[PDB]
Design a protein around this ligand. Structure first.
Ligand SMILES: CN1CC/C=C/CCCCCCC(=O)Cc2c(Cl)c(O)cc(O)c2C1=O
Ligand SMILES: CN1CC/C=C/CCCCCCC(=O)Cc2c(Cl)c(O)cc(O)c2C1=O
Lengths: 214, 214
C-alpha cells in the first residue's frame, strides 16, 4: 500500500527535538534502553504463551539480535518478542505514548541525567541520541508486518511492509546512525556497551558480524 | 502478485533429478560453482559499467556474501552482480537454459566426475547436491525484484518479491539444505571449502557469522 501519516502528541515531539539536539556525553545508554524494551517484549510473548502455547510457533526461538550494517550506516536491534499491530505502533509510538514524557523533560531541566529516561517509561526515544532517523518494523501474530518511521519531526508514517525481510514475529529497530556516531557499527564497541549495562538479560543477545574470508 | 508456474525444458528436469538423488561423495563442490556464478555476475556488471557508470549506483559495493541461517536450515549466497529480470530468470534458469545439459549427463554416464559440471555451463544445478529446494531472489537494474523457486520437480515458479529484504542489485541463492548436509551452516566448514576451491576471486567474499555475546 501507500504510507499514512500521523501527528505526534505535542510533548513527544518536544522530547524528541531536545534529544536529537543534545550535546550530552553518555550516548551509549540508548543501547541499554533498546535491549530492555526488547527483553520486555520477549517477557510478554513468553508470559502470553503460558496460556496460549501456539503464540510461539510463528517464531519458536526467543532472542535479541544486533546487526550492524556499516555500508548503510544502519544499526538493527531485533527481538522475537510479542511485536505490535498497526494500531499498536500508532498508539504506542506517538499518538498517546504519553505519561512520563513531561515528567522526564521537567526532571531534565532540573539536572537529571539523560540516563533516567527509562525510569520514566520513555527510553525508546533515547535512540535519537545516536540516530536521526528510525524505522520500527514489527510483526504481531495479530496483524501483517508494518513499518513505523520517524525523523524526530512532528509527524510519523506507518506503511504496510512489502520491502523488508519477513519477521516471523517481533520487532526490528532500524537506526540510521548520525555521521559522528558510526562507532556503534563496530563489534568491539557494541560488546563493551552490552557488558557494561546489560548484565542480567534472560535472553541470548546475538551479534551478527560480517568478516572477509582470506 | 500471485505466483506463475513454468515447465522446465525436459533435459533440465532430467539433470536435476539425477543430482538431487546422487550418492556422490564430493558434494562441497556446489559452493565453488555458486561463487563462480557470483563472480561472473559481478564481472558483467563491472564490465557493463565501463560505458555506463550509473549502473553501479544502485549498489556501489561489489561483493559475494555467504549467510548461514542455521535455524531455518538455509544457506544464502548473495552477490551484487548484474542480477536477472523476470524474463531472464525464466529463460536462464529452466525454459531454455539448455546447451551442455545433455552433454553433461552423457559425460556422467561414461564416468565423468560430477565436478566437471561447471565446464558444461550447468554448475548452477550442482546446488541440488546439498539442497532439495532453492529460491533465486534477483534484482536487475532493469526490473523489479523477483523470486524463482524450484524443488527439482518438473516445474518452477516466479513471483514478484514482496517478502524478502530489498537487494539494491544482484542475486541471492537461498539454499534449503538437506537434513544430512547441515554441516554447510558451520563457519569452519565454509571457510575450508572456499580456501580449497576458490583461491583466485577478484571480489571480497564475506561470511556473516552470528555469535552470542557473553
Ligand atoms: C515492547 N514491545 C511490545 C509492545 C509494547 C507494549 C507496551 C507499550 C510500550 C511503549 C514503548 C514502545 C515499545 O516498547 C515497543 C518496542 C520497542 Cl520500542 C523495542 O525497542 C523493541 C520491542 O520489541 C518493542 C515491542 O514490540
Ligand atoms: C550470473 N548472473 C547474471 C545473469 C547471467 C547470464 C548468463 C546466463 C547464465 C545461466 C546460469 C544462471 C546464472 O548464472 C545466474 C546466477 C546465478 Cl545461478 C548465481 O548463482 C549467482 C548470480 O549472480 C547469477 C546471475 O545473476
Amino acid at each position: 500500500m501507500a504510507s499514512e501519516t500521523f501527528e505526534f502528541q505535542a510533548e513527544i515531539t518536544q522530547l524528541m527535538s531536545l534529544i536529537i539536539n543534545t550535546v550530552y556525553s553518555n550516548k551509549e545508554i540508548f543501547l541499554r534502553e533498546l535491549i530492555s524494551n526488547a527483553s520486555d517484549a520477549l517477557d510478554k510473548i513468553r508470559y502470553k504463551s503460558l496460556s496460549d502455547p501456539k503464540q510461539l510457533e510463528t517464531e519458536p526461538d526467543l532472542f535479541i539480535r544486533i546487526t550492524p550494517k556499516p555500508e548503510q550506516k544502519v544499526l538493527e536491534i531485533r527481538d522475537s518478542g510479542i511485536g505490535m499491530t498497526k494500531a499498536e505502533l500508532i498508539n504506542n509510538l506517538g499518538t498517546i505514548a504519553k505519561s512520563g514524557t513531561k515528567a522526564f523533560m521537567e526532571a531534565l531541566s532540573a539536572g537529571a541525567d539523560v540516563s533516567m529516561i527509562g525510569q520514566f517509561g520513555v527510553g525508546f526515544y533515547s535512540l535519537f541520541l545516536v540516530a536521526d532517523r528510525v524505522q520500527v518494523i514489527s510483526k504481531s501474530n495479530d496483524d501483517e508486518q508494518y513499518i513505523w518511521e520517524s525523523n524526530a519531526g512532528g509527524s510519523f508514517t506507518v506503511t504496510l511492509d512489502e520491502v523488508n525481510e519477513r519477521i516471523g514475529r517481533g520487532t526490528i529497530l532500524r537506526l540510521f546512525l548520525k555521521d559522528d556516531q558510526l562507532e556503534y557499527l563496530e563489534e568491539k564497541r557494541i560488546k563493551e556497551v552490552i557488558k557494561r549495562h546489560s548484565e542480567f538479560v534472560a535472553y541470548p543477545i546475538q551479534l551478527v558480524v560480517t568478516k572477509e574470508v582470506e
